[PDB]
Every structure is written in C-alpha cells, then in structure tokens.
C-alpha cells in the first residue's frame, strides 16, 4: 500500500539507456514529498504538472522509467529534444506530462579501468518514436557488401559503452535518471 519508489530510486543497478527499464506504479499511496523535499537531485523538471501538487492528484497510470546516461546528455531527457539519446535511445513525447529527475552517480557507476556495464545506441536509420525501446543488436550495413552478422569495415555494431571512469569530467560522468509519467484523470 506504500508505493515502491525506494526500489526505483535505489536499485543497486540501473538499466542501460538503450534497454531502459519501465516500472509500473499502480494501486497504492505515494508520498511524492520525499522526492521534491530532497535537495540531492541535480535535475528536477516537471512538464504539464507541478511536483508540489502530485500528492493532491489522481492518475490512472504512473510509470517510472529509469536508466543511466552521461552528464551533458541529461538535457536530452525532455520534450522536443534532438541528439544521440533523444533520437536513438530514449525519446520523450512532445505532450509529455510528467517529471524528469536526475542525479550524479559517479561513486556508484564508475570503475577505475572503465565501467563497461552501461551502454547506448550510437546510430539508427530512423529516429525512435516517443517511448519506443530498441534493444536489437543488428550489424548496420553502411556500404554495399552484406555484413552477414559480422563486424567489419562498412559493417558496424550499433552500441557502445560509456566507459565511466571516476576521473572523467562532470559532462562525461554517469548520471542516474528517473522519468515519472502521469496519465491524468
């Protein structure tokens, strides 16, 4: 009966942005004040709804999307953005009604050699639809020779790792993101 936000905000591991995790929140009491009365979040932006009025509203569905990206990509998690994350990994719709929450996770998600656990899609022929997920790992044929499932020249694997390292600059450091969607009335 107490809605499971601690499971979402404090999972030991977060998903890769290309394989972003969706957790449905339904049929329980949620105290959203624990989020908005925290000062440990580096981004807290709500579109079409104010976070202070959330405890007072009734929603049919609530979804909590969660993933890791890097610092200078956090601006792509918003309606009407373009870029690698917005176009190929996680696309928010223009009419998004919800909250985007992010914080620096450099202590958790960096390793000294480089964390190769967290991945992103590098390229896609066409842009993702809003809230679409593409987890395919098809070799991309950039030339006229068929790739035949193997990486080669003009034959490219569509993902790469962030390689997070503690000594990276804040732009390249890992940031954990939670996107709360609200389906109204």
């Amino acid at each position, epitope marked *: 009966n107490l809605c499971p936000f601690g499971e979402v905000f404090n999972a030991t591991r977060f998903a890769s942005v290309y394989a972003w995790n969706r957790k449905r929140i339904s049929n329980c009491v949620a105290d959203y004040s624990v989020l908005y009365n925290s000062a440990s979040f580096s981004t807290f932006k*709500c*579109y079409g709804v104010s976070p202070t009025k959330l405890n007072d509203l009734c929603f049919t569905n609530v979804y909590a999307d969660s993933f890791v990206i890097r610092g200078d990509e956090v601006r792509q998690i*918003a*309606p009407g953005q373009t870029g690698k994350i917005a176009d190929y990994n996680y696309k928010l719709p223009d009419d998004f009604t919800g909250c985007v929450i992010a914080w620096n996770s450099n202590n958790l998600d960096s390793k000294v050699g480089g964390n190769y656990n967290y991945l992103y899609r590098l390229f896609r022929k066409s842009n993702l639809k809003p809230f679409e997920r593409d987890i395919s790992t098809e070799i991309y044929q950039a030339g006229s020779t068929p790739c035949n499932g193997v990486e080669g020249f003009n034959c490219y694997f569509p993902l790469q790792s962030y390689g997070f390292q503690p000594t990276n600059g804040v732009g390249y450091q890992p940031y954990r993101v939670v996107v709360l969607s609200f389906e109204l009335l």
Partner: antibody
Amino acid sequence: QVQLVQSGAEVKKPGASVKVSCKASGYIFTSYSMHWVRQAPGQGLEWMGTIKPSDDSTNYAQKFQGRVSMTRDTSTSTVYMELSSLRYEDTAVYYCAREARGYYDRSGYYHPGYFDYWGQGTLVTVSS
Amino acid sequence: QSVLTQPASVSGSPGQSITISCTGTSSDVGGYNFVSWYQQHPGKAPKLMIYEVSDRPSGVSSRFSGSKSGNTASLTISGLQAEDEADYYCFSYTTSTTWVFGGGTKLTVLG
C-alpha cells in the same frame, strides 16, 4: 525534424494589412507556443507577441496591442500574424519562432521556455 | 517595455575571452532569472546560445557562458574564434508578462 515554413515576401501600401503564415511540422502543434519577432533591415530584434495554440490565448507587446492579431489553425498546423494599419517603419523581416516547453521546478515555480526552432523569415515591405 | 542596453560593439583577438553586457531594470533582468542570449549571423535567423542566465542548450560550446549581477546580465565568450563574429542579443521576461530584446552588440574577431 521540426520545421517552420513561412509564407513569401509581401509588398503593401501604408494603411493596408498583411497576414503572414507559419506552417509547422514534425511535432505535436498544440504542445508548443509560437512567438513572432521582427527585425527592420540592419536593426535589432523586436518581440511582437505570442499565441498558445492549445487554448488560443495571446499576449502582445503594448506597441502592437489593437493592431496585431495572432491566430492558429490546428487542422493545418499553421500560425498566423496579421498586422493592420501598416506604416513605413513596419518594413521588416518577420519570424515565427517556437518556444520550447516550460517546466515546474521542485518547489513549484514555473520556468518558461526559449526559442528552439525558427522559420526562415518573411520580408514585409511597406512603401507608397 | 524598456529596451535592454547593450554595447553597440565589442572586439577581441582569437583565443581570448570577451564579455558582452546587457543592462536593463529591476522589472526585467533584475526582476527574473529568465535571461537568454541569442547569436545572429548575417541573413539568418537568431540562434539560442544561453537561456535562464547560464544554461546552454544541447549543441552549444562550453566557450559560451552566462552570468547575472543585479540589473546587468553578462555573456562571456572564451577561446574566441572567427565563427563567433556575429550580432548578439539579450532577451528577458518583463513584469508586464511580455518579453523584450536588447538592442544588440556586434562582435568582431581581430587578427
């Protein structure tokens, strides 16, 4: 991809009116406000006003109040700026610009947007 | 509303830091943190460099930076380059619920 395509160059006598269009595509038309900004040749940018296509609300700069009408056709994703009683100093390039969506911060204050896409501009020349 | 005051022009040598000032009033630049800075090359629409005093949209170099003290907003361009030769305009919200542009500054790159 977001594109704003404006109507073509206009030539008008003083006291006439002009209606410039701005056709939007590649996004949900009703999710973003549109603003009009003009620039006389060689001179600065001048904010004219804005329309919010969701509810059809408008807000004009005072020096245009009573003279400008901003409308919208959702069936065609088009915003219009109509300027009446044209003067010689109305000679300018008129731009439609889209405002990125604003947001509410953690303590509930509203932050408005900024201009993220622009039309190509429409020259209006007012001469006798 | 009161048009925001900027220097007609500034200049700097490549590699150096220049600063363009925008001074309005307590009812605009002093009234709110909704100050934006726009770049404009000849014959082209304006391009957003800075919004909300100091934030950058995606795709804009960290060389562009914004600050604000009292009624004056500052755009600072570091590591100056030839492609930065443009007009620059501040833009603010006003207590009348309108928006107003500054008069604009011509940046020239020496050398």
